[PDB]
Amino acid sequence: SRRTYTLTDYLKSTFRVKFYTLQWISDHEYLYKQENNILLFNAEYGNSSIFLENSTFDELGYSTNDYSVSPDRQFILFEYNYVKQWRHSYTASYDIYDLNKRQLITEERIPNNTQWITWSPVGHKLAYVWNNDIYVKNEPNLSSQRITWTGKENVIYNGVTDWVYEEEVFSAYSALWWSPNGTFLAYAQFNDTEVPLIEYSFYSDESLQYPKTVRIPYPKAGAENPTVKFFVVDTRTLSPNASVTSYQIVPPASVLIGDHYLCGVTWVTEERISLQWIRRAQNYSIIDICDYDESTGRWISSVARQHIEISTTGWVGRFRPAEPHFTSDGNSFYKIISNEEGYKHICHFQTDKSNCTFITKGAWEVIGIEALTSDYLYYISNEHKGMPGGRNLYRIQLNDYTKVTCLSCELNPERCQYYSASFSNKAKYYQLRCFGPGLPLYTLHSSSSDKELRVLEDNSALDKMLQDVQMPSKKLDVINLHGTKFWYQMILPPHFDKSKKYPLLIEVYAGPCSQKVDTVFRLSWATYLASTENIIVASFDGRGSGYQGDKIMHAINRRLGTFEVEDQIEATRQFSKMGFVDDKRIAIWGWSYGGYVTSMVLGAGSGVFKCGIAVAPVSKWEYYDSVYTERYMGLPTPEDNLDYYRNSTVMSRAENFKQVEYLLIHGTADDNVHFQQSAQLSKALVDAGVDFQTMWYTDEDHGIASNMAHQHIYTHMSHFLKQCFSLP
Amino acid sequence: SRRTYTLTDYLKSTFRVKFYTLQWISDHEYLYKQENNILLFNAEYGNSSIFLENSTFDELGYSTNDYSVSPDRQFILFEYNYVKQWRHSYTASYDIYDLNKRQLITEERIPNNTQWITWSPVGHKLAYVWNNDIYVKNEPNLSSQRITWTGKENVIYNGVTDWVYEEEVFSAYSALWWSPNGTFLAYAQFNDTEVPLIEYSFYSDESLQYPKTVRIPYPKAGAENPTVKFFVVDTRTLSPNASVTSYQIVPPASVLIGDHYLCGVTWVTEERISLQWIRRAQNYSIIDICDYDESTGRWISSVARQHIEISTTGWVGRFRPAEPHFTSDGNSFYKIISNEEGYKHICHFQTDKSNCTFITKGAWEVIGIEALTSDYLYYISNEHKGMPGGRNLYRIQLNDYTKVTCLSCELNPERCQYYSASFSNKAKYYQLRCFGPGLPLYTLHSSSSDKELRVLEDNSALDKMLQDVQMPSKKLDVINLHGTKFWYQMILPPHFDKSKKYPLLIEVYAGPCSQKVDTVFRLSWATYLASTENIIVASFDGRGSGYQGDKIMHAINRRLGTFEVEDQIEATRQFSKMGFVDDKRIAIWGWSYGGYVTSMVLGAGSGVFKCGIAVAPVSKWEYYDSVYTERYMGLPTPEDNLDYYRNSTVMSRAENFKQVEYLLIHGTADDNVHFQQSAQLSKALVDAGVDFQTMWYTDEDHGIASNMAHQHIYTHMSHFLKQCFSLP
Numbered sequence A, B: 001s002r003r004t005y006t007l008t009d010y011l012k013s014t015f016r017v018k019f020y021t022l023q024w025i026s027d028h029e030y031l032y033k034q035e036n037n038i039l040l041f042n043a044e045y046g047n048s049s050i051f052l053e054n055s056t057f058d059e060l061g062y063s064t065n066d067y068s069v070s071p072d073r074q075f076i077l078f079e080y081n082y083v084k085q086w087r088h089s090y091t092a093s094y095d096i097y098d099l100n101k102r103q104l105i106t107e108e109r110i111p112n113n114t115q116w117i118t119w120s121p122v123g124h125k126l127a128y129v130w131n132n133d134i135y136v137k138n139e140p141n142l143s144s145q146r147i148t149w150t151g152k153e154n155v156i157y158n159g160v161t162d163w164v165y166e167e168e169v170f171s172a173y174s175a176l177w178w179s180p181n182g183t184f185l186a187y188a189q190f191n192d193t194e195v196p197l198i199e200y201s202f203y204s205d206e207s208l209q210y211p212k213t214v215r216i217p218y219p220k221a222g223a224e225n226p227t228v229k230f231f232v233v234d235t236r237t238l239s240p241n242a243s244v245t246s247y248q249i250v251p252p253a254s255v256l257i258g259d260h261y262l263c264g265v266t267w268v269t270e271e272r273i274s275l276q277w278i279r280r281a282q283n284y285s286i287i288d289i290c291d292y293d294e295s296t297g298r299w300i301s302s303v304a305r306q307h308i309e310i311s312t313t314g315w316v317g318r319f320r321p322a323e324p325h326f327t328s329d330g331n332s333f334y335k336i337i338s339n340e341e342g343y344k345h346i347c348h349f350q351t352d353k354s355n356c357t358f359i360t361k362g363a364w365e366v367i368g369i370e371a372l373t374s375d376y377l378y379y380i381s382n383e384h385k386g387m388p389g390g391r392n393l394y395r396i397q398l399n400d401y402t403k404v405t406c407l408s409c410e411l412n413p414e415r416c417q418y419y420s421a422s423f424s425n426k427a428k429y430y431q432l433r434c435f436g437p438g439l440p441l442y443t444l445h446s447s448s449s450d451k452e453l454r455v456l457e458d459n460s461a462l463d464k465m466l467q468d469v470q471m472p473s474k475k476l477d478v479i480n481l482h483g484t485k486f487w488y489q490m491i492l493p494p495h496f497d498k499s500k501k502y503p504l505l506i507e508v509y510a511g512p513c514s515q516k517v518d519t520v521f522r523l524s525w526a527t528y529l530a531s532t533e534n535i536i537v538a539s540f541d542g543r544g545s546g547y548q549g550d551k552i553m554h555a556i557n558r559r560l561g562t563f564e565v566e567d568q569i570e571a572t573r574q575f576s577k578m579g580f581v582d583d584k585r586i587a588i589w590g591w592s593y594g595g596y597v598t599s600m601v602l603g604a605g606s607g608v609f610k611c612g613i614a615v616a617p618v619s620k621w622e623y624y625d626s627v628y629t630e631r632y633m634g635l636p637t638p639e640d641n642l643d644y645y646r647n648s649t650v651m652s653r654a655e656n657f658k659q660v661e662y663l664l665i666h667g668t669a670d671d672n673v674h675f676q677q678s679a680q681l682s683k684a685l686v687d688a689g690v691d692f693q694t695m696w697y698t699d700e701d702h703g704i705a706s707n708m709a710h711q712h713i714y715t716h717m718s719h720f721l722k723q724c725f726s727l728p
């Protein structure tokens, strides 16, 4: 008979996809967590030794969720008492374990509620953030040293990002940067004094008699932004009775004239640091390469070492300007910029010269630079087969730009089209990470021989379970939209027959620079909808989508909610034409940006879609943060782009919702897309006399990722989808 | 064929129910608003003089929502700029208009955002509350005198209630009482310093970038309560260069010892004030009659003038102890208290004596004392035909308690079973307000011979319209529960067919001291459901309900959510026996307490109910305010009633919601039963893995009373019910 992939199968994750997380600690060695044992593996041969046994964790008393070994391998840092804040930020407790005398350190411990901690890149020094201030510990058993004194809740952040820099700029909580040999500690300071607060109720545990108000400094579009300062601290002079030796690096004049962001930091040498700034407008970026002056302790900038990157058609980079990758000596660097054809490729910059040489070109894009030696450059691109939803590792010879070899293209062509890589310290070995379209495959390689050393994880146990089950098929193809090639995928039910008519669900994100259509293997909600419920789940990457050139990406510049929404409709019209698609039962669903598109599509009046589900959607762009919104939309002033802000709200299309069956879902504790967004939307539908369904989730944030809520939302969305599709 | 009463018919109020609101300003004259004209109607004859023409409103510029004429007929107050706050509270702008010179007052105006205003009982003195402080104007054209200096937003209230006193104690916003001749201005001061704030988001209009937080001093069960001070201000010495002359009256020792409330103020004479105090527990009440001392200015209490009223089984009175009604001389008063058998009846108290004499008796309850003369006492009761859901006017002779005449019973016995009354200044005339079971009929009567002088409004226009529509019928009957006869009502569809199986909707409130079964005529949502959708709507009054004696009422004392919930289930079980009720299609719905009962019924696991809707329900009693909750539940402490607080939450019954289809509705701006309640309820259901439906209403309070929100909720509830009842 054969069982199908059920909703319970996804929700409880009975079909476990395995992975291989390793941590490179040398040119040939890496650590790997195996049944809570830390094993030190050797790449050269394959032999492993016990670095830390599992019994060491058992005698700690607490459950350890993360560990971090010092580069000198003398000490390890144990992370416990994990408390999540935002997407990347969290607070935790930390213990240091001596590996020499196999004992715990109990004096001068890392304080509880620590916001960030990191080892220096050499030895066993520590830098940590507590109460918005930076502390440095030279020795694990010695007293720490306070570096900053300005730390203040919701106001001053030293060494860690505020809300907006975490989500939109750094994609991390950390704002600390040790110099390669630990001489210097660089950090950013964020000032949120003038940033307005978003407030919302957190109800907490049932026992809480009164709800509390969460207050976050969150700059909405056009609002007052956080200011930033950058300091380099000399850690050589750090001493109990000495002042902190620090130098403030200010941005170049062309950026200093207005509101700006610090978007990147790269340590070049011990005496050379690179800083990436961007204007508030985000179409003008500058790299400032600053040199340490030994006699004054200053970090000097010069116009010769300043490198401008602009965009005339839109914004710079994907979500941020691409990071510079410096040579060992630091006299030149390699960086992804847009070329003349509007395709993102690797350009070779000299540190004190303004012109660069492109080392890659074509109707495809370099995703990122992975590694660099004096002879080779390793990078990821979507060049292979001309499919942008694919990823491969490429190696280009530095002395001869023509010699470019693909190290992952032909290893497993059918099974593996989507690759990521992780290199050892001097790029002597690399782990390859296959993500699809077949079962994820983890392999280790040598860089000298290009040979596959061994299989680390092939997910054979997963293959054993999947042959028992009625798996759906994932087909990737292309269609024509307004004279432009655009990619799409379809999750097709098992025993797919083109005579029978199937209902259609459009799974959308369609955000700027994003990619919904790729060759990644995923056990998803759509997996169950095709397998058990026999629904076609299709996804489409139209205008505004990334990895296909500036032309396609910058198409929605200053006009969010237009082309990317219109293309979702037109592509579905094309899907509905196909004989196997029931035009009576067509739905659309999306998360966050996907929810906004879903809503805008459902407010279009296209008649194409019968129903849709929007989860935690943006409803009005003035409600979303400055960095993300202004990037694509500019400022919401009549002097700028207010007109396009006004006619891109979902509320402006409230009238057209009367035809469709709408499900609006939002978490009340959403710090990202605030509950306000769905609240104001629902109010405009109530006002318009539109009937629709709603679902709030108490104390859930943007991910609605708590176990029971995750279970509930998909259960509830399935019921709504089945009711709309008249499915038993 | 004939049309049915639609949902649009209810929501748009196409079938208008007329009424007759008049203002008694003498013992034989009253004012009435007709075509925007205020006419001085004479009860003695029937002739009406034009007091203020309709064109006078139009010259002012604004739209006027209320008027108030000074007792000497020299001035009129105009109320405009009405801004709602809580249930009774609002701010408004005010203009005084001279009737002599027919001119507006323009010098020294009543301030913007005035909280409360009142004329003195004689002459034309004005007292008002602005920014939490009291102001007295002796003359409308004269400058105002500040009475209090303590007024502070969310902290100190002079002359107006705080949240809890408005909702639960006074049932009004005003805390000001002029003395009969206007010599004294009495007021209460409320101090909310230690009362914890409820905070919730108000999103406001779409243009508001950041949501604001509303903060209300709201004491939840067992929390710190507002304190009260009572003052009497001698208004004779009020002068620009003079201090305020005031005396503070404190509660008697027996009440002073602990937490207490002021629940009633009654002016007896010019030198005699009556204060009603109640302990926090609300089972001990005292009446303090205080005498003005001319030589010192003090108001004196004496033990002989103190009248205790206690409850050993529950609480005192219904929601508060009944008010004392004093004779002209002030040496005696009549007050409704519980007699031997626990029925509420009028007792004749002497002012300086403890023992009282009951003037009424029987297995029925006096609803209220309306008027009193030297000869007669006029009151409202449910004596007639033994039905507690009926009201009638009765007159009892003060020299002979045998002579009691029913003045309303036999005027229209089949049309009028529910009555209200408004008496002239000396009780020489009265208006009789009939509310059912037939169309409302408003009449005028003399007290001399009790003759129907004329018909003021008889709803003839509505009667004409009702002939064209298929009206449902209202059946009132009795069922026996555990050896006690309780009353119930049923709204039956047009052309009732005994062969067909009709779906059943239970409309519940069930709050302590409440009544869902009455003879009141109501064009309602249930009207539509019977007429158009052919659904039987039933209501029932079980244990805990009022107007049937203390035994039934106090049945749920310290155990809310038990007996009243159990009686709803068992009564419905009895209704499902009837051959015309489809036991497979029974629903239950309710608002506030009705939402709580609905929820508690649905989670009872009775299997009797298929589905249900809870609108703005209490989910946990610790979340609700101190006064209401503690009255019935005591304190949520292990020493007191925590055990019954714990097991009476809806969240504890979460597991049983898997058997039912649940719809949970709450307004996000609910200041009464906070959104927290449904937020905590939904979270527990999510935790239990229960599927259910939800609907938040942005910025709506406890009444969800806005135009579009009102329309939307019933539309949404109608579609949910139809889907549950499998109705096309």
Ligand SMILES: *[C@@H]1O[C@H](CO)[C@@H](O[C@@H]2O[C@H](CO)[C@@H](O)[C@H](O)[C@H]2NC(C)=O)[C@H](O)[C@H]1NC(C)=O
Pocket (backbone or CB within 6 Å): A035, A036, A037, A054, A055
């Ligand atoms: C501690 O490490 C031991 C290895 O010494 C783990 O034992 C292994 O358990 C797996 C199943 O998870 C077996 O398949 C292996 O045969 C075991 N290894 C050997 C060689 O004994 C043990 O699981 C670890 N303990 C904890 C806390 O998980």
Ligand SMILES: *[C@@H]1O[C@H](CO)[C@@H](O[C@@H]2O[C@H](CO)[C@@H](O)[C@H](O)[C@H]2NC(C)=O)[C@H](O)[C@H]1NC(C)=O
Pocket (backbone or CB within 6 Å): A560, A561, A562, A644, A647, A648
């Ligand atoms: C906001 O308004 C603009 C201008 O009126 C819209 O842009 C037009 O979109 C239609 C597509 O239906 C095109 O045919 C026109 O060429 C566009 N006009 C201009 C001036 O560019 C835009 O679509 C509106 N935004 C949304 C989200 O509805």
Ligand SMILES: *[C@@H]1O[C@H](CO)[C@@H](O[C@@H]2O[C@H](CO)[C@@H](O)[C@H](O)[C@H]2NC(C)=O)[C@H](O)[C@H]1NC(C)=O
Pocket (backbone or CB within 6 Å): B150, B156, B191, B192, B193, B194
């Ligand atoms: C409202 O009540 C509070 C008590 O809760 C009063 O605050 C006190 O004021 C006195 C005299 O000024 C101070 O000595 C105390 O420190 C306060 N008590 C506490 C514990 O807070 C306040 O005075 C009252 N307000 C009014 C106008 O009556």
Ligand SMILES: *[C@H]1O[C@H](CO)[C@@H](O[C@H]2O[C@H](CO)[C@@H](O)[C@H](O)[C@H]2NC(C)=O)[C@H](O)[C@H]1NC(C)=O
Pocket (backbone or CB within 6 Å): B560, B561, B562, B644, B647, B648, B649
């Ligand atoms: C929770 O509190 C008590 C738990 O003992 C419940 O007890 C009462 O109700 C029972 C109904 O099954 C009766 O059989 C018991 O006689 C009665 N307890 C006594 C001895 O007084 C109570 O009903 C529960 N309340 C709620 C809201 O469910």
Ligand SMILES: NC(=O)[C@@H]1Cc2ccccc2CN1C(=O)C[C@H](N)Cc1ccccc1F
Pocket (backbone or CB within 6 Å): A167, A168, A169, A170, A171, A319, A320, A511, A514, A592, A593, A618, A628, A672, A673, A702
């Ligand atoms: N997650 C992403 O695709 C990108 C990646 C990235 C890269 C550099 C710096 C930050 C980020 C985070 N990314 C984002 O898209 C962040 C956005 N806030 C996600 C988002 C977009 C629209 C609406 C809601 C929302 F959360």
Ligand SMILES: NC(=O)[C@@H]1Cc2ccccc2CN1C(=O)C[C@H](N)Cc1ccccc1F
Pocket (backbone or CB within 6 Å): B167, B168, B169, B170, B171, B319, B320, B511, B514, B592, B593, B618, B628, B672, B673, B702
């Ligand atoms: N409206 C009512 O039935 C009573 C009447 C009354 C009498 C004296 C003083 C105040 C009041 C107001 N009444 C109330 O029941 C107030 C309650 N807070 C209403 C209520 C009860 C349960 C749950 C929610 C809710 F708003």
Ligand SMILES: *[C@@H]1O[C@H](CO)[C@@H](O)[C@H](O)[C@H]1NC(C)=O
Pocket (backbone or CB within 6 Å): A040, A041, A042, A045, A047, A048, A049
């Ligand atoms: C692996 O074996 C080699 C033998 O030459 C040894 O040098 C190396 O230390 C071993 N690796 C481990 C597990 O440390």
Ligand SMILES: *[C@@H]1O[C@H](CO)[C@@H](O)[C@H](O)[C@H]1NC(C)=O
Pocket (backbone or CB within 6 Å): A150, A156, A191, A192, A193, A194
């Ligand atoms: C933060 O900025 C404010 C102005 O917005 C300024 O007054 C304050 O001094 C700054 N604090 C620091 C430590 O930079």
Ligand SMILES: *[C@@H]1O[C@H](CO)[C@@H](O)[C@H](O)[C@H]1NC(C)=O
Pocket (backbone or CB within 6 Å): A240, A241
């Ligand atoms: C630093 O100063 C403190 C307090 O004055 C003193 O105890 C300590 O000895 C000093 N440390 C050094 C290294 O001189």
Ligand SMILES: *[C@@H]1O[C@H](CO)[C@@H](O)[C@H](O)[C@H]1NC(C)=O
Pocket (backbone or CB within 6 Å): A281, A283, A284, A310, A311, A312, A313, A314, A634
């Ligand atoms: C950068 O953005 C600003 C403000 O939106 C705009 O005026 C300017 O044209 C942009 N510059 C380029 C190179 O497009």
Ligand SMILES: *[C@@H]1O[C@H](CO)[C@@H](O)[C@H](O)[C@H]1NC(C)=O
Pocket (backbone or CB within 6 Å): B042, B045, B047, B048, B049
């Ligand atoms: C009302 O009209 C009657 C007519 O009989 C007249 O006697 C009386 O004066 C009038 N009263 C007023 C002033 O309204």
Ligand SMILES: *[C@@H]1O[C@H](CO)[C@@H](O)[C@H](O)[C@H]1NC(C)=O
Pocket (backbone or CB within 6 Å): B035, B036, B037, B054, B055
């Ligand atoms: C004002 O009153 C007159 C009669 O005095 C009446 O005809 C007119 O309709 C009224 N105007 C309105 C509607 O305000």
Ligand SMILES: *[C@@H]1O[C@H](CO)[C@@H](O)[C@H](O)[C@H]1NC(C)=O
Pocket (backbone or CB within 6 Å): B240, B241
């Ligand atoms: C009250 O005092 C004011 C100002 O101090 C003064 O102008 C006025 O004359 C005084 N009023 C009387 C009645 O004396």
Ligand SMILES: *[C@@H]1O[C@H](CO)[C@@H](O)[C@H](O)[C@H]1NC(C)=O
Pocket (backbone or CB within 6 Å): B281, B283, B284, B310, B311, B312, B313, B634
């Ligand atoms: C009223 O209730 C309180 C608190 O439970 C109690 O201490 C007191 O004895 C009660 N009074 C009466 C007369 O029942």
